[PDB]
Enzyme design. Structure first.
Site, mmCIF file in Angstrom:
data_model
loop_
_atom_site.group_PDB
_atom_site.id
_atom_site.type_symbol
_atom_site.label_atom_id
_atom_site.label_comp_id
_atom_site.label_asym_id
_atom_site.label_seq_id
_atom_site.Cartn_x
_atom_site.Cartn_y
_atom_site.Cartn_z
ATOM 1 N N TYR C 106 0.017 -1.672 -0.116
ATOM 2 C CA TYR C 106 0.234 0.172 0.294
ATOM 3 C C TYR C 106 0.524 0.537 0.139
ATOM 4 O O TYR C 106 2.315 1.372 0.444
ATOM 5 C CB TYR C 106 -1.019 0.038 0.825
ATOM 6 C CG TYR C 106 -1.822 -1.142 1.178
ATOM 7 C CD1 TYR C 106 -1.942 -2.498 1.545
ATOM 8 C CD2 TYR C 106 -3.058 -0.483 1.057
ATOM 9 C CE1 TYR C 106 -3.041 -3.340 1.910
ATOM 10 C CE2 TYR C 106 -4.378 -1.178 0.418
ATOM 11 C CZ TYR C 106 -4.158 -2.637 0.785
ATOM 12 O OH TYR C 106 -5.256 -3.565 1.842
ATOM 13 N N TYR C 145 -0.723 -10.483 1.094
ATOM 14 C CA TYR C 145 0.039 -9.533 1.701
ATOM 15 C C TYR C 145 -0.087 -9.774 2.947
ATOM 16 O O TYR C 145 -0.633 -9.861 3.860
ATOM 17 C CB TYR C 145 -0.267 -7.953 1.487
ATOM 18 C CG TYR C 145 -1.492 -7.277 2.169
ATOM 19 C CD1 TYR C 145 -2.016 -7.354 3.370
ATOM 20 C CD2 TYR C 145 -2.332 -6.228 1.254
ATOM 21 C CE1 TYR C 145 -2.867 -6.630 3.943
ATOM 22 C CE2 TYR C 145 -3.313 -5.822 1.383
ATOM 23 C CZ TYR C 145 -4.093 -5.618 3.156
ATOM 24 O OH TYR C 145 -4.800 -5.293 3.268
ATOM 25 N N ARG C 155 -3.530 -12.209 4.096
ATOM 26 C CA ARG C 155 -4.703 -11.104 3.996
ATOM 27 C C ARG C 155 -5.047 -11.667 2.346
ATOM 28 O O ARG C 155 -3.925 -12.295 0.909
ATOM 29 C CB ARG C 155 -4.404 -10.054 3.896
ATOM 30 C CG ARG C 155 -4.587 -9.010 5.015
ATOM 31 C CD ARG C 155 -6.307 -8.400 5.089
ATOM 32 N NE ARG C 155 -7.166 -9.639 4.547
ATOM 33 C CZ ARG C 155 -8.358 -9.554 4.210
ATOM 34 N NH1 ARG C 155 -8.542 -7.903 4.102
ATOM 35 N NH2 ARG C 155 -9.684 -10.013 4.190
ATOM 36 N N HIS C 158 -7.157 -8.299 -2.342
ATOM 37 C CA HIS C 158 -9.075 -7.565 -2.294
ATOM 38 C C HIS C 158 -8.675 -6.178 -2.324
ATOM 39 O O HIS C 158 -7.459 -5.449 -2.648
ATOM 40 C CB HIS C 158 -9.118 -7.775 -0.691
ATOM 41 C CG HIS C 158 -8.532 -7.440 0.852
ATOM 42 N ND1 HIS C 158 -7.687 -7.596 0.571
ATOM 43 C CD2 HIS C 158 -8.471 -5.626 1.392
ATOM 44 C CE1 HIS C 158 -6.525 -6.251 1.447
ATOM 45 N NE2 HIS C 158 -7.751 -5.711 1.949
ATOM 46 N N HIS C 160 -10.628 -2.580 -1.052
ATOM 47 C CA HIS C 160 -11.368 -1.946 0.089
ATOM 48 C C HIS C 160 -12.579 -1.460 -0.928
ATOM 49 O O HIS C 160 -12.522 -0.125 -1.999
ATOM 50 C CB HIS C 160 -10.446 -1.026 0.744
ATOM 51 C CG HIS C 160 -9.884 -1.671 1.551
ATOM 52 N ND1 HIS C 160 -9.854 -2.847 2.952
ATOM 53 C CD2 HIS C 160 -8.368 -2.121 1.533
ATOM 54 C CE1 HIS C 160 -9.001 -3.189 3.374
ATOM 55 N NE2 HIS C 160 -8.168 -2.995 2.689
#
Ligand SMILES: [Fe+3]
Ligand SMILES: [Fe+3]
Ligand SMILES: [Fe+3]
Ligand SMILES: [Fe+3]
Lengths: 238, 202, 238, 202, 238, 202, 238, 202
Positions: C106, C145, C155, C158, C160
C-alpha cells in the site's frame, strides 16, 4: 542392478500432436504416426552438467536481474520433488524455467502486449535437483495474458519448465499453473491433454505451512519422469 | 504406479528460459549454446545446419533445437554408458540452438560421432539424436540425423531398417558438402506434407 | 409514493463486533449491546455529491497516478450494480475504493512490507453510480499480503470499498475478493462473517465475455444496500 | 428478498481511499475534508474535537470519522428531507476526517445544527450524527453528539429518552467551551470499559 | 453509450467445420484453422431493410402461395424473441425462413423425393422483428424426409432460418426442430453440435396456451445472437 | 450469460428461402438480389465474379454468397457507422446471389468501395466482406476480397498483415481485367487443398 | 540444511483460552489476545537431558513404586512415535507422564476421592524418544473419576503427558484417552477442542497384535509437534 | 501435512508427573528442580520470585512454572544455538517449580542471562522465557521476564517494541532489589483484569 530400457511413454497421458482447438498445431503436427523404436544406448544416456557452472542467484528470479530495485509483484517460492514413474528420486537433473512478469509481459522482442515491462525482472532461472530429487526457486507470480488463438484468448498464469535428466528418453518440457486460477478451465492449450487427472497434474498447490511470514507465499509442485526397468535375465540393450 | 507429467508446448518465447542471450537477456555467467567443440576435443569438426518447415513449406522462425551424440569413438559422455571405454574428457555431447528470427536457419558446430553399439550385439551407423520444440508443438519431436557419406553403415543400421516404408528412410540422411574448407551437413526437417521427416517415439 | 423507514439491518448477515479470531477487535469492540432506535429524518437523509467535481480519471486506477509509465500488474476492469434490498437501483451513490499494488504493497506511510512500491500506481479511485445503479472502474489486480494477526497471516487479494447513498442508515464499508483465490478460505477477517452465503456475497466473479482482447480481464461484482419501505397508512416519520 | 452486502473492517490504511491527502497522495483535484463551513454558510461556527479510546484507554491513531447534520434551521441538504423548508444553499452537511497519527486528535469545522422534527410530531434536540471506522472495527459504529448548553432541549429528546439506562445518556453530550474567541465542543468517544459511549443501530 | 466490439464467438458452442458423420462436410471444410481478427467498422455494421418493401402475407406461409385452395397439412404458428447474448432485444432484424411441405417435399428443382408436392404451398417467408425482438409467422408443419448421407438417413421435421441484424459479425443461418420428434436423437447434422444443451437450443417448444381454438397450434422459439460490449475507456474501434 | 444459437448448414435447397426466383418461386413482390448499383449510385461500377471449389477442385453448384461493403467514400450504409460522414443515399451496400446450377459461376454488379478507417487510427485498404453458405458447410465461411490494382494500400492493410503466413495473403486479392468496357474482378474461392482461401473468425 | 523458524501454531487446532463449559477457565484466561512474535534463538532452542540420569524403571509405572507387591489394575503397555508436523522424527525428546490409579485416585495431597489408594502404585514416569521418535512405557490403566465442574462430572480414563523437545516453541502438555471409553463424548475438557478430528487425535488405539500373551494389552498413540521450515534464501533468524 | 497434537490443561495434579517430590512421591533418583546454578556456573546469581493471580486477584496455588534462558554470555545450552560461541559447560538453562500450596509463591535460583542476538542483526535485551501451566489453563501461557536495571537495553528490544500498546510493556519488567546480600527480581503475573501480563504466541 543392471538397468534395462525406460518404460514406454503412455501416449494417452499426453496431448496428441494434432489439436485443432490450439490453432498453431494444425500446420506444425506430423500427419504420419510416430515410429516406435526399441531403445539403445543413445536413448538411455544423457548429458551431465556440473554445479559450479551455476551462479548463486540462478534460482532466484527476484534478484538475478534486479538492477536499481526489486521487481513489482507477488513474492512466491516454488519447491517440490522430481521422481521417476517408479517413485525413484531424480538426482542432479537440470531444471530450467521461464515466465512472464506480474503484468503478463515477457521480456522477449516478439511481445508487444500493453502489459507493462519491469526493469528489475528477467523471467528465467535454473537449478539442479539434489540427491532426493528436491528443487526450489523464488520468483514473482506471473500474470495471465491475452494471445491470439481465438481473438479474446487468455492464458492462465503459468511457469514454463524444462528437464534434462538421466536419459534422453526422459527429455520433457511443460508448464505448471496455480491452484484456484479460473482461467485454467478455459485454456485451449491445457485442454489438449485428454484426461482430467493429467490436467490436474500440472497445478501447483498452495503450501501454506511453508509460507515465510511477512515475506513470501509458497507453492508445492512435483514432477514425474519416465523410469527405467531393472533387468534380471537377458541384457539385450547392447 | 505414477504417471509421467504431461507435456505442453514450449510456446513462442521458449528462448527466454533456454537461450537468454538470443532474447537479449544476460542473467547467467555461463550460457549453454550450439558449440560442442572445445580446444582439445577429438574427431573431425563438422557443421550441422538446416531449417524446419511447417505444413505450408514455411520455415519456423521460433523453433528450438537440441542434439545428443557420442564422441568420436562412439562413446557417450554419460554415466549411463556401459561400454567400459573411456570417453573424450573434453566433450559434453549436447548442444542447444534456435533458428534465426529472420531466415529460420539453425546450426551446430560439433564433431562427427563414431559408431555406437546397437541392441543384441549389433552396430548402429553414426547418428545424432535431435529434438524439436516450438509453438504449436505439444510434445517435443524426436528424430535422428545420419550421414550420406556413410551409406555402407546406414544400410545395416537397425533403427533405419525398422522403418518398413523404405522410401522414408532417406528423410533422415543429411547431405555432406565441403564449403571453403569446413565440412557441412545440410539437414532440413519437414513436419508435414510430402517428404515429411520421420519422427520417433523413443 | 411516500417512503417510510429503512428495513431493519439483519445483524445475523453481518460479522459481530467482537471477533476473537481477528485480534484487534478484542479492544475495539463495545461491551454493551447496540441500542436500536426508530428512524427520523436524520437517518433517512444523506449528502449529495455533484459529478462535475470528479476528474476524468477518478475511476481509472491505471492512469490517475501514472507519471513516467504504466503501473506493473494485471490490467482488470471491475463493474456491477448497486441495488437496495428490494431490488431497486441506487442512483448517484458515491463509491470509493482503495487497494494495494501488485506486490501487495500500500502507498501508505505505515506500510513497510518488503513488497515493492510502484512509482506509477496510487491505489485509489471513486465514481458515482448511474441511473441504473451501474458502476465501473479500471485497475491493477492487488496482490495478497502478510500482516500480523497470527505471525504468518495473509490477506487474500482484495479491494476496499465504501458507499454513501440516499440514506445515512445505508452507510457501508467493506471489501470484495476475487473468485478462485485460495487465501479466501483461511482469512480471519472474512470469517468474522457468520454464514457461508454472505461470505460468498463478497466475491467478484470472472466475467469472461466482458474481457477486452489483448487488453484487460473483467470481474462482475454487485452490491446490495438496505432499502426503504413504502408507507400506505399513517406517516409517523415526522 | 436480497440480503445486505456484509460489512468488513475499513482496515489500517482506510486513509488511502478516503483521505488521500493525509496519506500524501495527490490524485484528485477536489478532495473531501472536515470543513463544512463555506463563505456564505449560515449559523454560528463551531469546532468539534476529541479522541477515540480503546479498551485500554489508549487513543486510536488510525480511526476515520464522518458526520452528518442539518443546517442552522434544522433542515437537511438532502432530497429525502420532507420538511418543505428551503435549505442553506451553501451547506453540504457532511464531512470526513482522520485522527492524527501521533496524538490521536480529530476535529471538524462546522456549524451548530438547528432542531430537527422527530417522529409523531415531536422535536429532536440539536445533534450531529457521527460514525467511526477503523482497524478492529468490523462494522462502522453509529453514535450522536448533543450539546450541553442545550440541556432543556436534550431533556425532551426522543432518542436520548429511548435509553433506559439514564446514566449512559451523558456520554452523548459534548462540553462547550470558548477558546480564544471560537466556540469548541469536546467530544471523546470510549469504545470499551467504563463510561463506554452509547452506540446505535440505526 | 459508446459500443465496442462483439464478444468473441465461442467455437465450442458451434459444430466444427469438419464433421465426418455429415459426409458432404469432408470436402467442403477448410484444412487450415480460421484466422481470428480484431473487429473494425466492417464487422460491426450491417445493412438496413425498410418494412414497406414486405408484402402483407410475407410471414404467412399458409396463404402467400395459396392459389386454388389451402395447402394440406398441420396449421401451426411459430413465434419467439431474438435477443443478443447479453439479453438485449434485437430490433428490426431480418428473419428469413424456408421449409419443405407436409410430405417432406421441397419446391426445388433438385428434389425428386416421392413425397407429394402441394400446389398451394411455397415454403418460404420473411419478417422483421419488432422493437422487443419479437417475431411471428404462420405455416404448415414440415414433414421429415429421407436423404442420402448413409442410405436410409432421415432428417427430423425442421425449419431453416436466417438472420441479418445489426452487425455483420452476427450473420447466422441455422435450423430449428419440434419438441418430441424422435428423429432428433439420430440426426447426423444435429450431432455436429458438440454439447447437448446447445442441441436443445434448437428445439421449438409446444406453447399450448397460445393455441388458437379450432384453428392452429403454436410453438415458441427464441434466438440468441452475439452481442456487443460497451466501452468505457479507450475507443480503439477507429 | 446466454449462449449464441448454434449454427447449422444452410442445406442444398438454401435457395427456396433466400432466392425464391432462382428456385422458380414467386411469392415476394420485392426480391433481394446481386445488384447493388441503383440509378444514382456513386462510384465506378465493377462486376465481381468467380467460382467456389471443393477439396476435389470441383465447383459448388449449390453455394450461396453474400457481400457487405462501404460506399465509394468508405462509409457504410449502417447506423453502426460512426464516421460522421454522410453515406451515399442510393446504396444498400449488401447483395446476395447463388452459383449457377450448371457452371457454378456467381457474380455481383456493384461499386468499388472506398478506404475504410481501421482500428487505432489506421486505414484499411478497399475491401468487400464476403460469406459462403452451402450444403456441407456447418457455419458460414467469412472472407475478404481485396483488389490487385490497389497494391500500395494492401501492403499497409492491418487485416492482411495480421496473417503471419505471408504467402496466403495473395488468396484474398482479386485480379482486375477490363472486358469490353466493363471492369471485372475475378475472385475464385478454394475451400480446401492447395491455395486454400483464407477464412476469418470475425 | 539451515533451519528457519517453526511453522505458526494453528490456533484453530487447539482449544481457545476461554471455555465457559470448563468452569475454572473463566478466571484463568487472559482477556487480551496473545501477541504473536517473529521467532529468535530464544524460541528455536531448548534444553538437553542426558539419558544416564534416568533410572532403569523410570518408564515402568508397574514397578517403579512397587514395594510389597504389584499394583492392582489392568496391565497395559503404551507406545508410539513423536514426529514433527512435517513428518520428521523427534529424537531424544523428554516425555513425562502422570496418571491416577485403577480406582481413579491420584497420589496427591489434594485428592480425597473415595476411590481407593494403591500402596504399590505411584502414577508417574518419564522417557526419552529414540532416534526414530519411538517411545514406550508400561502402566496400569487409570480409572475414570468424578470432579466438580457441574456436580456429577466425570473424566474419562486418561493419561497426562508433557513434552520438551528441540525447540521451546514446541513445548506441549496434553492428555490422551482410550479407544471405546464412553465418557469421551461427554467430557467438558475434551470439548474445549473445536474440531472432531482433533479430538480424535487424542485417542490411543488398541494395538491387538502387540498384546503380550497372558501378560499385557497394548495401545498405540502417536504425538505430532510443531516443525521447523528449512531456509534456502535469506537467513534472518539472527 | 500433519496437525499438531491438541493441547489440554495440565490439571490440578500436574505435580505428580512433573514434581514428584512436591507431591511427596519418591520414584526418581535424579529429580528436576528450580535451581539452575551449579558449583562452577558463571555469572551473577539471582533469585527470581513472584506469584500468579487470577481474575479475582487471587494467587494460583496449583500453578506450575518453567523457564528457559541463555548463559551469562547470551549463549543457549542447545545444539540449535548457531552463535558459534562456546556455552557455559555447567548450565542447563532450564528449570521447573511449583507455587506453594499455601502462600502461592514460586521462585528459581538462577543466573542473569547475557544479551542474545535478535533477528536481522539486532540485539535482544537480557530476558528469560517463562511458561505457565495449571488447572483452568488449556494451553501453556508464554511470556518473558526482562529486568528494570537494564532500561537502556529494553528500550531497544525488538520484542518489547513489537507491542504497539506501549503501556503494556512494563508488565514484562521485573523489579530488582537487594535482600540481605542476594539480588532478587520480583515478577508477578496477572492473568486477567487490570495490568494483565502480556502473553505471547511464539
Ligand atoms: Fe507462456
Ligand atoms: Fe487491505
Ligand atoms: Fe431441409
Ligand atoms: Fe487427570
Amino acid at each position: 542392478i543392471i538397468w534395462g530400457a525406460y518404460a514406454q511413454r503412455n501416449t494417452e497421458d499426453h496431448p496428441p500432436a494434432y489439436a485443432p482447438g490450439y490453432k498453431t498445431s494444425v500446420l506444425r503436427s506430423p500427419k504420419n504416426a510416430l515410429i516406435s523404436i526399441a531403445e539403445t544406448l543413445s536413448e538411455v544416456t544423457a548429458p551431465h552438467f556440473s554445479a559450479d557452472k551455476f551462479g548463486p542467484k540462478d534460482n532466484d528470479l527476484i534478484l538475478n536481474y534486479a538492477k536499481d530495485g526489486l521487481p513489482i509483484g507477488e513474492r512466491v517460492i516454488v519447491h517440490g520433488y522430481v521422481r521417476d514413474q517408479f517413485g525413484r528420486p531424480v538426482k542432479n537433473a537440470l531444471v530450467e524455467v521461464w515466465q512472464a512478469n506480474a503484468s503478463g509481459r515477457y521480456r522477449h522482442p516478439n511481445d508487444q502486449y500493453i502489459g507493462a515491462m519491469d526493469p528489475n525482472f528477467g523471467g528465467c532461472g535454473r537449478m539442479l535437483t539434489d540427491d532426493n530429487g528436491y528443487y526450489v526457486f523464488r520468483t514473482i507470480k506471473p500474470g495471465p495474458y491475452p494471445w491470439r488463438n481465438r481473438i479474446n484468448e487468455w492464458r492462465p498464469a503459468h511457469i514454463h519448465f524444462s528437464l534434462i535428466a538421466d536419459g534422453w528418453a526422459q527429455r520433457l518440457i511443460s508448464q505448471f499453473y496455480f491452484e484456484g486460477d479460473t482461467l485454467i478451465d478455459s485454456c485451449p492449450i491445457l485442454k489438449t491433454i485428454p484426461s482430467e487427472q493429467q490436467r490436474r497434474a500440472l497445478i501447483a498447490l498452495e503450501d501454506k505451512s511453508n509460507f515465510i511470514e511477512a515475506d513470501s507465499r509458497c507453492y508445492r509442485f512435483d514432477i514425474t519422469l519416465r523410469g527405467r526397468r531393472a533387468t534380471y535375465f537377458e541384457n539385450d540393450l547392447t | 504406479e505414477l504417471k509421467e507429467t504431461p507435456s505442453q508446448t514450449g510456446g513462442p518465447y521458449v528462448h527466454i528460459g533456454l537461450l537468454p542471450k538470443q532474447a537479449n537477456i544476460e542473467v547467467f555467467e555461463h550460457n549453454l549454446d550450439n558449440n560442442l567443440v572445445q580446444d582439445n576435443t577429438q574427431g573431425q569438426r563438422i557443421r550441422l545446419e538446416g531449417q524446419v518447415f511447417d505444413g505450408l513449406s514455411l520455415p519456423l522462425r521460433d523453433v528450438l533445437i537440441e542434439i545428443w551424440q557420442a564422441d568420436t569413438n562412439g562413446v557417450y559422455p554419460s554415466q549411463a554408458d556401459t561400454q567400459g571405454k573411456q570417453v573424450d574428457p573434453n566433450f559434453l555431447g549436447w548442444g542447444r540452438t534456435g533458428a534465426d528470427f529472420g531466415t529460420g536457419f539453425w546450426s551446430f558446430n560439433t564433431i562427427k560421432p563414431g559408431a555406437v553399439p546397437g541392441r543384441k550385439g549389433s552396430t548402429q551407423a553414426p547418428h545424432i539424436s535431435l529434438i524439436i520444440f516450438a509453438r504449436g508443438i505439444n510434445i517435443g519431436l524426436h528424430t535422428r540425423v545420419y550421414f550420406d557419406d556413410e551409406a555402407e553403415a546406414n544400410a545395416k543400421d537397425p533403427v533405419l531398417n525398422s522403418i518398413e516404408w523404405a522410401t522414408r528412410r532417406q528423410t533422415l540422411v543429411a547431405k555432406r558438402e565441403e564449403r571453403d574448407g569446413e565440412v557441412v551437413y545440410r539437414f532440413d526437417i519437414r513436419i508435414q506434407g510430402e517428404n515429411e521427416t520421420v519422427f520417433f517415439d523413443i
